Structure 1
C-alpha cells in the first residue's frame, strides 16, 4: 500500500556437506567434491603403458635366462610387474648388489640381447645341470656359458671383445663356487684362482670360494653374478683359469621411462594412466591415499583419506515464518539460480534469479576445479619403498626420504584445501554483498535498508518497476518525489 519490499538472497539446499576452511574446522556448504582418490579397481590396466607380467619370473631370472623365462627373451616394457609367487628354477645364484642390477635393468626397459662369438679355444662350452631343466633335458641359463675343462686341460683364458658400436653394452657374467675340491678338479682340472674382468676404465677381480652351502634344489654350489658396462671405443677383457660362467653376448642398455613394480594385482584389458601395486587408479583427483608406490600420471600420495573442496556457498537454513533476505537466512525455494530477488508489491510476492551473480560464482568455482582436476604429473622409475630384508643405513635413508616427502605433501594438501575453501566462501559471500550494494545504489533515496537483506521501497512499485531494478534500468528520478513524501512524513 504505497510501498513495496525487495529482498536479496541466495539459495540453500536440504543436503549440504561439511568442509574445512581457515576460519572454521567445520562449515556446511551446498556442495563439495573429493580431492583424495581412495579406491582402486584392483586390476592393473594393460593400456596405455606397456606392461610385462613376470608371472613366475623375477626380472633378474628373465635376464639370466632361467628356462621358465624363455618366453621373455628380447621383450621391452614400460612397467615390469614382479609377482610374490615368483621363484628361481635353475642353478642357485646370488647377485652382490642385486638391488642395483635389478634397478638398472628395470630402468633400461629392455631385455634385448645380441650374441657374440667369444674365442673359447681350449675349453668345453655349454655346461649343463640337472638343477636347470629345459624341455626335460639338463640345461643352463640361456645367456650364460658354463665353460669346463677339455681333455683335462683348462688353459688360461685371456679373451677380448671390443665395443665397436655407437651404443653401450651390458655384460652379465658369473663365478662358480663349487661345493667340494672334487667338483673343482672334475670341472676345471686345477685348483681355483681369481677371475679378472676389465676394461680401459674398470676392473673387477673375483675369487671363487670352494665349499658346501646349504643345498638349494639339491645343489650345495653357488654362482655369483657380476656385470660390466662397456662403452663405445672400449674393450672387454676376460682373464680366468677356471670357475668362469661366461657371457654369450651383451644386453642393450637404453635410457627412458621404464620401471618395475611388485604387485599381485591381475592385469586387465582396460586403459588407465596411473598404476599402483593395488591396481590402476583414476587420476582425476590431485591426491590419493591408495599407495605411495606409483607409476605414470598419478595423483600425489598423502596421508589424509579425505579432503573435501567446497564447490558451493555456505548452506544456511531458511528461518521459520513477510519475505526476508540473506541476513542469517538461505532460500531453499530458489532452484534456478544461486542468488536472486524476492519482492512484495501490489501484484503479489515473487522471486527471480540473478544470472550475472550466479554465473560469476559458478565460473570462479569451475576455474579452481580446472586447476585441480585432471592435472596430475607423470613419474616413472623412483626408489623402492617397501623392503623384504633388514639392511640398516641405506634403507633407513630411503625410508626417511619418502616419509619426509609424504609429510610435506600432506601438509601442502591440507593447507591448499583450507585456503581454497576459505576463498570459495569469501567469493560467494562477495557476490551476495555486491548484488545488495548494486541494488542499494540504484534505489538512491527511494528506499531504506530494513537490516534483513531487504529494502523498503517508499513508492508503488509494480511488476515492471521491480523488473527494472533487477534489470538495472530503474530510473530513481521518476519516483523520487513520491518516495520522499512517503519517507519524510510526520505520522
Structure 2
C-alpha cells in the first residue's frame, strides 16, 4: 500500500504585482511600498526649530520692516516663507538678493548687536511715510538713514574693528533720490558716493537722481548691499552723501539651518522630514512628494510607486 509525501509552498488569493529584471509584471504573495507619496499637509513644529515668516520674508525680518519687529534676534533650523508675504517699509532692491537670503538662511540666526558709529556732520535716524512703525513715520530698524546737519555735509570716514571670534555681517545701502526736490533737501549738495571697505574688501556705490515707478506711492529706491568682516579685520566707511548705514552687525553662524517656501500650516506634531507640501514620514527610502526637502528624508525619485517583493512568487490553486 505505502504512502505519499508532497512538498509544497503557500499561496494567497490576493497577490501583488512587482517588477523584476526579466519581467515587468510578476505576481508575488506580498510586497511593500518603497516610495512615500503622501503628506499629512502640515509642517510639524518638531523636532526642528521652525520659524514661520508669516507676512515677512527673511530679508524683511533682516532689514527690520516694522511688521517684522517680532523676529528680532530669533534663530531657526527652518525659516518658512509664505507666498502671502509683502514688504511695507521703504521700497528697495538687493543686487544678488538670492545670495543674501541664502547666507542668512544658512546662518540660521538674526542675532544683532548694536554699534555706536561716530556719526557727526549728519542727521541720523531719517524717516519716511511709507515705513510706518507704531503710527509714526519710521524706517528699517537695522538701518540708519543719514541726512544733513544745518544744510551742510562733510566727508565721512568712520571705522569699526571686529575683535570677535565670528564673522560680522554688515547690512547697508544707498539712497537714489526722486528729483532735485530730494537732492538739496536731505543732503545739501550736487553729488554723492559711498565706499564700504575692509583690509580684504572694497565696495563703492554711486547714487542716482531719478524717479522710479511708485511702489506703495514712493518713487525713490534704496539699494541694499552687504559686507562680511572677519576676526582681526576692520570695516571702513568713506561717505560723501546718501549712506543708509548699519546700526551694528549680525552674527554669522555655521550650522544646519535653511529656508523653504511653503504655504503649509504649522502643526503640533513630530516629524523628521519636511517638504513644502508638509512633513512626510521617512520609513521609506524614496519619495515623490517634493524635490525640496529638509531633514532626514527619503530621496526624491520620479516614480509614484516601487514595490519590493517580501514574498515568493504567487501560484494560486
Name the TM tier (shorter chain): over 0.9
Higher share of residues assigned helix: 1
Is 1:171 aligned to residue 179 of structure 2? no
Please list the CA deviations of residues 442-476 of structure 1 after superposition, one character each: whole Å capped at 9, or x if unmatched: xxxxxxxxxxxxxxxxxxxxxxxxxxxxxxxxxxx
List runs of 5+ in structure 2 lacking aligned partners: none
| 8 Å CA contact 1:17, 1:29 repeated in 2 | yes
Q: Out of 233-242 and 53-62, give the one that drifted further.
A: 233-242
- Alpha-carbon distance between aligned partners in 1 of 2:213 and 2:24, rounded to the nearest angstrom: 61
Please list the CA deviations of residues 289-320 of structure 1 after superposition, one character each: whole Å capped at 9, or x if unmatched: 00000000000000000000001101001xxx
Please list the CA deviations of residues 6-64 of structure 1 after superposition, one character each: whole Å capped at 9, or x if unmatched: 10000001111000111211111110000000000011000000000000000000000
Please list the CA deviations of residues 155-201 of structure 1 after superposition, one character each: whole Å capped at 9, or x if unmatched: 11100001111211000000000111220110101123221010010
Deviation at 1:247, TM superposition (A): 0.2
| 8 Å CA contact 1:83, 1:264 repeated in 2 | yes
- Alpha-carbon distance between aligned partners in 1 of 2:268 and 2:85, rounded to the nearest angstrom: 23
RMSD (Å) for aligned C-alpha atoms: 2.1
- Alpha-carbon distance between aligned partners in 2 of 1:263 and 1:233, rounded to the nearest angstrom: 40
Please list the CA deviations of residues 47-89 of structure 1 after superposition, one character each: whole Å capped at 9, or x if unmatched: 0000000000000000000000000000000000000000000
SS, match of residue 135 in structure 1: coil
SS, match of residue 61 in structure 1: helix
SS, match of residue 183 in structure 1: coil
Higher share of residues assigned strand: 2
Bigger CA radius of gyration = 1
- Alpha-carbon distance between aligned partners in 2 of 1:316 and 1:217, rounded to the nearest angstrom: 72
- Alpha-carbon distance between aligned partners in 1 of 2:165 and 2:12, rounded to the nearest angstrom: 69
SS, match of residue 176 in structure 1: strand
- Alpha-carbon distance between aligned partners in 1 of 2:28 and 2:160, rounded to the nearest angstrom: 72
| 8 Å CA contact 1:96, 1:225 repeated in 2 | yes
- Alpha-carbon distance between aligned partners in 2 of 1:166 and 1:12, rounded to the nearest angstrom: 68
- Alpha-carbon distance between aligned partners in 1 of 2:109 and 2:190, rounded to the nearest angstrom: 38
| 8 Å CA contact 1:289, 1:302 repeated in 2 | yes
How many residues are paired up? 315
| 8 Å CA contact 1:94, 1:224 repeated in 2 | yes
| 8 Å CA contact 1:36, 1:289 repeated in 2 | yes
Higher RCO (CA 8 Å, separation ≥ 6 residues): 2
SS, match of residue 259 in structure 2: strand
SS, match of residue 102 in structure 1: helix
| 8 Å CA contact 1:192, 1:243 repeated in 2 | no
Provide the TM-score with structure 1 as the length reference: 0.64
Q: Out of 138-147 and 160-169, give the one that drifted further.
A: 160-169
| 8 Å CA contact 1:92, 1:216 repeated in 2 | yes
Provide the TM-score with structure 2 as the length reference: 0.98
- Alpha-carbon distance between aligned partners in 2 of 1:122 and 1:44, rounded to the nearest angstrom: 51
- Alpha-carbon distance between aligned partners in 2 of 1:308 and 1:262, rounded to the nearest angstrom: 31
| 8 Å CA contact 1:91, 1:132 repeated in 2 | yes
Please list the CA deviations of residues 234-282 of structure 1 after superposition, one character each: whole Å capped at 9, or x if unmatched: 1100011111000000000000000000000000000000000000000
SS, match of residue 185 in structure 2: helix
- Alpha-carbon distance between aligned partners in 2 of 1:315 and 1:256, rounded to the nearest angstrom: 50
| 8 Å CA contact 1:144, 1:246 repeated in 2 | yes
SS, match of residue 124 in structure 1: coil
**Aligned residue for 2:115?**
116
| 8 Å CA contact 1:92, 1:223 repeated in 2 | yes
Displaced runs of 4 or more, over 4 A: none
Please list the CA deviations of residues 416-441 of structure 1 after superposition, one character each: whole Å capped at 9, or x if unmatched: xxxxxxxxxxxxxxxxxxxxxxxxxx
Q: Out of 185-194 and 82-91, give the one that drifted further.
A: 185-194
- Alpha-carbon distance between aligned partners in 2 of 1:184 and 1:93, rounded to the nearest angstrom: 18
Please list the CA deviations of residues 89-111 of structure 1 after superposition, one character each: whole Å capped at 9, or x if unmatched: 00000000000000000000000
| 8 Å CA contact 1:177, 1:208 repeated in 2 | yes
SS, match of residue 189 in structure 1: coil
- Alpha-carbon distance between aligned partners in 2 of 1:24 and 1:169, rounded to the nearest angstrom: 60
- Alpha-carbon distance between aligned partners in 2 of 1:185 and 1:208, rounded to the nearest angstrom: 14
Deviation at 1:120, TM superposition (A): 0.1
SS, match of residue 141 in structure 2: coil
